[PDB]
Amino acid sequence: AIGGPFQLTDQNGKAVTDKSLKGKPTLIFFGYTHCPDVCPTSLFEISEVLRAMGKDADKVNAIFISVDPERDTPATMKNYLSSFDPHLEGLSGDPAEIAKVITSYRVYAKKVPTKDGDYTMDHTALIYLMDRDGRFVSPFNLKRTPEEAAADLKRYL
Numbered sequence: 001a002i003g004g005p006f007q008l009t010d011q012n013g014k015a016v017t018d019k020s021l022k023g024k025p026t027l028i029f030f031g032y033t034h035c036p037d038v039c040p041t042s043l044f045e046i047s048e049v050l051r052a053m054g055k056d057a058d059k060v061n062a063i064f065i066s067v068d069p070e071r072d073t074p075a076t077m078k079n080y081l082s083s084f085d086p087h088l089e090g091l092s093g094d095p096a097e098i099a100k101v102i103t104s105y106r107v108y109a110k111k112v113p114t115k116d117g118d119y120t121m122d123h124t125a126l127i128y129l130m131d132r133d134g135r136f137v138s139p140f141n142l143k144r145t146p147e148e149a150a151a152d153l154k155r156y157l
């Protein structure tokens with residue numbers, strides 16, 4: 001089964017587990033705060049879907065899990081997510097827990113050293129849709145208007 005148990009921390013320091021994602025459909029994106037193009041564009045596109053949901057945005061989970069736990073602490077994630085829709089929840093964790101979640105969600109993440117102790121990460125770019133029971137449905141299509149993506153997500157309410 002794609003996905004597994006976890007215990008992570010949101011950008012406000014609140015504990016978040018797999019069990020707390022149950023009851024709502026869930027979009028998940030794995031990335032990192034120092035990503036130059038893919039992450040801000042993906043998280044912007046998700047943000048527009050959440051805006052197009054209106055009041056229903058509170059009835060889904062939209063989760064950004066960092067694959068760069070050495071840098072993406074709650075405070076870093078909070079400030080990063082400040083630019084994006086406020087419904088996005090950013091999850092940080094102990095390196096052990098992130099490595100576990102990466103394996104159970106079949107994520108690819110690889111550090112790529114640049115220069116002077118800095119680095120980028122190659123990583124999975126797909127958006128995961130999990131149902132309200134936490135069961136993987138499919139990857140989620142963002143190549144369409146925010147309203148079309150919102151209408152699709154609403155079917156999982």
Ligand SMILES: [Cu+2]
Nearest residue numbers: 031035038039
């Ligand atoms: Cu990225």
